[PDB]
């Protein structure tokens, strides 16, 4: 009937509001910390919203939908994964009082879609475009958008890695980017972090052997995937062992059995073999390794699946399996190998990979004490992420609360100008846009209502004036502070929030189960 | 556990009997609604049968068990009419408990009911008709079939199946000294065509249930043959499998089976045999191997079915394989395959027999309830035609017989010494429950219609006035061509009287209290 769907909608709205209010005092650089307690008694201090959203667990359709929305927002854009929850909560709080009066959800959804389209068009018409066909303007935009993510010393430390990673000019200013398609940043322990340089081909870190000379050029990779494990017995001891007889049998089975397979395999050119991880093999027979020491020995272990996928994509080959194989589709490229250490500990080999169809290049970073390596990794990750976000479009704008107030005033004037019963619903959107500046003013340590009123008055008087400052603690113009953000991080977020609100509003009736 | 002493046991028994009869009192007549049934699973069916409903009925009383046992044990001589007897017994028990409250022994009423039923039968034997010849049972055949079947499974009429069922009994009645056997006629049912495709198998029809219709099968036979010697490797009633500890015996057995096939076909070609059916068989692989080459023949003929194969030919059998000739077999007339679907299996219909001992009917359907209703109507028609050929005496139906019997009982028992009026009047006035219930099942008032028909029957003569359940013109009985057998009514009255006497006799105490 009508009471059951109304109660279901009220319960869903209450659950969504509780989920949104469980975390709210964390937006901005001056956010509060939270100590999450584990099930065993361990406590962990954190302040990121994504970690708290992915760590906690709760069974509810609205909570699962919000988690999926946050995950999609973090995957698509990559920044600002906490404002969408507040936007959805404000929209649901507005829809609550909209439905309390007696309005059909179809008109409310149409008004929300119209308001979203108007806000998107206003954000696109207000933002200013830039250029990026050359390298000077691109480097200027990079150094202008990179000096506002972390602290000053960390920024100065990551600037060399940033300008080394931004030099990867492969796509000639296309529509989309492939920064997540052919990038494999490895990590190496030991040495100095200053010894970093872009490396093509392939980089490994496992010792080949320990014999005489191993400086050859035979494809430098063994395309083999068949089983190399020893045939396991049916039980411990099949018979009674004491004197000879049984000793000679096992001796011949250990010496004159796998050696025949090694001989029949080594009859083909390019004697390069390897193996994957030693997660299922108990112990490898060293007699086979001693017999393989002659006529050139080359073996590399500790190989994962991602390494195989990277090698099969950079070179441009396909692995083969099975034993009955009389083809010749397993060779590679021969150029140069056999590398030594770079004045320090830790074995690491590099291959530049000359004359190869795949121009994939990675960055080999280092560090010490496992303290500046992960930080630099996260820094270059955020760097290439914001670089891809900037190269995806061309529009940019500054943050602080001014665009939110501008959009709220525009929606208010549009609802005042546009006629129809839906305009009231549009007015609800006008009351669901002044949450970020109020939260920022509350977290800064000033009066939020007075600051919001002053910002609204300044926007109504001189259009584009200033916003909300954090370092100084007042109202200063943003043009002096080097801080900007792309337009996609707002447009995509607003569209996703509107879609989630429409999906959670269109779902009602009864919730049957099995 | 206390013992029920006094009159509480009889009251509880009568209450249980009334509660049981209240279920059958609702469904009475052709205008009754469909009663539903469901087991433990999700099988929900709907039907209207006095025996099928009483069969799957769960009760917690020995009296109800005895009642349903007596109702099920008597159903082969009446056919249709196992519902009014329960209502009559319930009304009689109600009258008995009403008359017993004044302080009357049940022996008196139990003895009075005997002579009441006796005089009722004596009066019903004199109010009938005996002017049926070779035309009165042949011309109103369509009317009798319409009154027996009705309009439940098919709105339109059916004349083919009725005439077929009539001829199937006429070809056996006068041929075996005006006698018929129940084991001679059989009822077969299989889905396929429509209901109008009713076939009368003069001989015997046998199915084979094939496995692959795409296999080439050409009919080319003209003489049947019956044998008892192992025509092929037989199956001695034991599930044979791979019980050979060898690897080369399979090919040897296959070659031996091929040589046996060749020898058998050469013998049946040099002697003149064709479709030779034995009493053994093998797996489907041997049948496929035999049907792959030439000469089509299918095995799998195990069971008692061979018995009919020993009666649909005409002769004897051979005790030894080395005793075959051109005269020890049996000649045939027209033995071929029949398959109206031309997409399923085949059937064999014997068209050569010196006697009629396996005549059957074949009716096609499209579901599960329509075929069941058709077979029930066919069984009812067979029962009524058997009752007709057993005795050429019928009576009119509706609700006039009970009223006439009650009036005659009153007129002949108005005189009483001290107990010849109470029990007889309690048996007489309780006979008007069937017409009252039949009139109440429709949309008319039963009391007014019953009083009007009673006044019309007591004013003038011709006791052939009742009620109409189809809403027509007048309330006559000789114009609607409605008839009912008298032997069935006699049997129903006798069964009701016996049940009432057995209930009124066993009523002392109970052990499990």
């Amino acid at each position: 009937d009508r009471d059951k769907p109304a109660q279901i909608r009220f319960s869903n709205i209450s659950a969504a509001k509780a989920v949104a209010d469980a975390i709210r005092t964390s937006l901005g650089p001056k956010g509060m910390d939270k100590m999450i307690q584990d099930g065993k008694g361990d406590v962990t201090i954190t302040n990121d919203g994504a970690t708290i959203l992915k760590q906690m667990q709760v069974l509810h359709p609205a909570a699962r939908m919000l988690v999926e929305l946050s995950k999609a927002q973090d995957i698509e854009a990559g920044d600002g994964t906490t404002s969408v929850v507040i936007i959805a909560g404000s929209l649901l709080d507005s829809c609550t009082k909209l439905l309390q009066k007696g309005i059909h959800p179809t008109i409310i959804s149409e008004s929300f879609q119209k308001a979203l389209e108007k806000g998107i068009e206003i954000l696109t018409d207000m933002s200013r475009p830039v250029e990026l066909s050359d390298r000077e303007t691109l480097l200027n935009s990079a150094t202008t958008s990179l000096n506002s993510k972390v602290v000053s010393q960390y920024s100065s430390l990551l600037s060399p890695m940033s300008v080394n990673a931004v030099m990867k000019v492969i796509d000639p200013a296309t529509a989309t980017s492939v920064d997540l398609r052919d990038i494999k940043i490895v990590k190496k322990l030991g040495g100095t972090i200053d010894d970093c340089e872009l490396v093509e081909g392939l980089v490994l870190t496992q010792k080949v052997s320990n014999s005489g000379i191993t400086r050859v050029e035979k494809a430098k990779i063994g395309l083999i995937q068949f089983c190399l494990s020893a045939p396991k017995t049916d039980m411990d001891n099949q018979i009674v062992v004491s004197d000879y007889a049984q000793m000679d049998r096992v001796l011949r089975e250990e010496r004159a059995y796998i050696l025949n397979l090694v001989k029949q395999i080594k009859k083909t050119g390019c004697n390069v073999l390897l193996i994957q991880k030693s997660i299922l093999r108990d112990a490898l027979s060293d007699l086979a390794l001693h017999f393989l020491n002659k006529m050139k020995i080359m073996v590399i272990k500790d190989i994962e699946r991602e390494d195989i996928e990277f090698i099969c994509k950079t070179i441009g080959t396909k692995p083969v399996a099975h034993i009955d194989q009389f083809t010749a589709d397993m060779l590679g490229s021969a150029e140069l190998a056999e590398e030594v250490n770079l004045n320090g500990s830790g074995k690491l080999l590099k291959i530049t990979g000359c004359a190869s169809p795949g121009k994939t290049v990675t960055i080999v970073v280092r560090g010490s004490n496992k303290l500046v390596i992960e930080e630099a990794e996260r820094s270059i990750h955020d760097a290439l992420c914001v670089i891809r976000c900037l190269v995806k479009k061309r529009a940019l704008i500054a943050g602080g609360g001014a665009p939110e107030i501008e959009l709220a005033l525009r929606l208010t004037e549009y609802s005042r100008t546009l006629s129809g019963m839906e305009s009231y619903c549009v007015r609800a959107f006008a009351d669901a846009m002044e949450v970020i500046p109020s939260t920022l003013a509350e977290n800064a340590g000033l009066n939020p209502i007075s600051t919001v009123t002053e910002l609204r008055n300044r926007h109504a008087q001189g259009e584009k004036t200033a916003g909300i400052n954090v370092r100084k603690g007042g109202i200063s113009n943003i043009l002096e502070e080097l801080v900007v953000q792309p337009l996609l991080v707002s447009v995509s977020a607003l569209t996703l929030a509107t879609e989630t609100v429409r999906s959670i509003l269109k779902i009602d009736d009864v919730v049957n189960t099995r | 556990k206390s013992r029920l002493m006094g009159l509480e046991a009889l009251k509880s028994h009568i209450m249980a009997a009334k509660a049981v009869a209240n279920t059958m009192r609702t469904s009475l007549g052709p205008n009754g609604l469909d009663k539903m049934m469901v087991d433990k699973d999700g099988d929900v069916t709907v039907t209207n049968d006095g025996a099928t409903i009483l069969s799957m009925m769960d009760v917690d009383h020995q009296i109800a068990k005895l009642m349903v046992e007596l109702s099920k044990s008597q159903d082969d001589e009446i056919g249709d009419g196992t519902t009014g007897v329960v209502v009559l017994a319930g009304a009689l028990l109600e009258e008995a408990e009403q008359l017993l409250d004044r302080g009357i022994h049940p022996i008196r009423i139990a003895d009075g009911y005997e002579q009441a039923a006796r005089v009722a039968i004596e009066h019903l034997d004199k109010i009938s008709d005996s002017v049926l010849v070779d035309i009165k049972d042949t011309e109103p055949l369509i009317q009798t079939a319409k009154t027996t079947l009705g309009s439940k499974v098919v709105n339109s009429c059916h004349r083919q199946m009725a005439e077929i069922a009539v001829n199937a009994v006429l070809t056996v009645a006068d041929m075996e000294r005006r006698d018929v056997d129940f084991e001679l006629i059989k009822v077969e049912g299989k889905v396929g065509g429509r209901l109008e495709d009713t076939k009368l198998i003069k001989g015997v029809i046998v199915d084979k249930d094939f496995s692959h219709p795409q296999m080439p099968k050409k009919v080319e036979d003209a003489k049947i043959a019956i044998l008892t010697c192992p025509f092929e490797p037989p199956k001695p009633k034991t599930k044979h499998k791979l019980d050979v500890t060898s690897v080369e015996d399979y090919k040897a057995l296959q070659k031996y089976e091929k040589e046996k096939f060749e020898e058998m076909i050469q013998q049946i070609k040099e002697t003149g045999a064709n479709l030779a059916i034995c009493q053994w068989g093998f797996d489907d692989e041997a049948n496929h191997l035999l049907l792959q080459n030439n000469l089509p023949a299918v095995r799998w003929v195990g069971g008692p079915e061979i018995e009919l194969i020993a009666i649909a030919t005409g002769g004897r059998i051979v005790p030894r394989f080395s005793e075959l000739t051109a005269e020890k077999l049996g000649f045939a007339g027209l033995v071929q395959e029949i398959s109206f679907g031309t997409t399923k299996d085949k059937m064999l219909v014997i068209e050569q027999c010196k006697n009629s001992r396996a005549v059957t009917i074949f009716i096609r359907g499209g579901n599960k309830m329509i075929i069941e209703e058709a077979k029930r109507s066919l069984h009812d028609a067979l029962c009524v035609i058997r009752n007709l050929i057993r005795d050429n005496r019928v009576v009119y139906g509706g609700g006039a017989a009970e009223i006439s019997c009650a009036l005659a009982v009153s007129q002949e028992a108005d005189k009483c010494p001290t107990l010849e009026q109470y029990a007889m009047r309690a048996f007489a006035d309780a006979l008007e429950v069937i017409p009252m219930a039949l009139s109440e099942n429709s949309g008319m008032n039963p009391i007014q219609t019953m009083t009007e028909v009673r006044a019309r029957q007591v004013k003038e003569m011709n006791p052939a006035l009742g009620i109409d359940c189809l809403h027509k013109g007048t309330n006559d009985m000789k114009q609607q061509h409605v008839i009912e057998t008298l032997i069935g009514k006699k049997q129903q009255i006798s069964l009701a009287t016996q049940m009432v006497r057995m209930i009124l006799k066993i009523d002392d105490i109970r052990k499990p209290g």
Binding site: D324, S503, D509, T513 | M215, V247, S442
Partner: protein, 499 residues
Amino acid sequence: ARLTSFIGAIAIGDLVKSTLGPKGMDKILLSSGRDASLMVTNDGATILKNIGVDNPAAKVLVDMSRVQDDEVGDGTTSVTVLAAELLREAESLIAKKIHPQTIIAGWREATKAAREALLSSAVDHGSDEVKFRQDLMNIAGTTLSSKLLTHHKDHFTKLAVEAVLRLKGSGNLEAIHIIKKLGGSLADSYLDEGFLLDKKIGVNQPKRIENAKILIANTGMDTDKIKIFGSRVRVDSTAKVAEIEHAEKEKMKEKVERILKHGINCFINRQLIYNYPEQLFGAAGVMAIEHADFAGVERLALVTGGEIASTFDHPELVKLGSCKLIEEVMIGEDKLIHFSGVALGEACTIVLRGATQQILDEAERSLHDALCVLAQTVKDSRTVYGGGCSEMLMAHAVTQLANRTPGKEAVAMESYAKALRMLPTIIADNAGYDSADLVAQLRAAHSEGNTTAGLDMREGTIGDMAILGITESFQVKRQVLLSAAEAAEVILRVDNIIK
């Protein structure tokens, strides 16, 4: 008293009551057990199929709805709502001390009057090609206007029309077959003159095959045919396995030599082929196709007059087909075998793209409705108006007929006419407009003398249905009414205890 089965059958109809009209309500179906799933649906058939009840009348109604959905198109929610309304009316009619026989007679009379009014009101003005074209276009637009998804409807409608119009009045349902394939964009449509497969063995096998000639060889390597070259195993030692393997290898090599000397280039089959015979065929130079579907070979042999080899029986009796051009063009995101170079344009398969699901079901339903309405109106066009026009006329005819029959069955006809005037009310209520005023205006317009009057869904007004352009089928409404009447007569006749 009788109320349990009635309530159980009425409550099962109110669950999908909000799923009527183009602007329907959505709901989720939470699953139990180990993993709790979550999905969004917008159709009553999927909800009725993924549910479990225990009442006899409810089970009978569910079975009848499933049978009707398997028969015609999307006839499951309307019949259920009509049966629920009829049962709700019959309950109140019985509660007023009324015999069920009079109610059944009145319902039969009302159904007969409605059928007569529907048969007497049928248009027949289609003596041109453009008329049939616009009629099919309007039918497809009315059928595709049930989910309210304005993204890619016109192109899909035109594609379906072009695919269903190529039959040219040919009565067949095994020629046109659709497949399931995702990946790409919604604005991507590929047109071809043949069909594709659904599985590829790889690329290691040679793809250069000339002289196309289809040869269906049902040679089984593990079905125990005539003259077994091998044997079983004994109980003596463990050396017979090598002999069995050698026998199987020589038997399969003899079969390969036979199939090579018989003359073949593109081997296709449907049995289970092991790795050794497949590798032998690949090394020989013949491409072998394994793991075939249950309807690909059948539809390939049906359109060419061919058939299976009957598990190796008569190799010189089964007629085989041949093609001209067979290649493997990399289209979309998968490599499939093409079937071009033929003169039979009856069997076609249009591949689809996009990043959404639950489209093949509605596509097949629309194609079924289209070919049904094409084979029904081959030479006699019979179409009616929609938007709540035939129901109002039927109710008016029933009300007019329920006035010259003195007796007691007029109340049943009145209840039937009242229950028949409820679908437009629910349709208008599901959108968000005043349903009472619209229903009153429609009734006044129908009683004044206007057989062409309907309601609008874009603005919520009352206009003409013959000017905008909207129609539907003719036998669908008749079948719906017949099924509803049959279900009502079946359920109403039961009132005794459930035993």
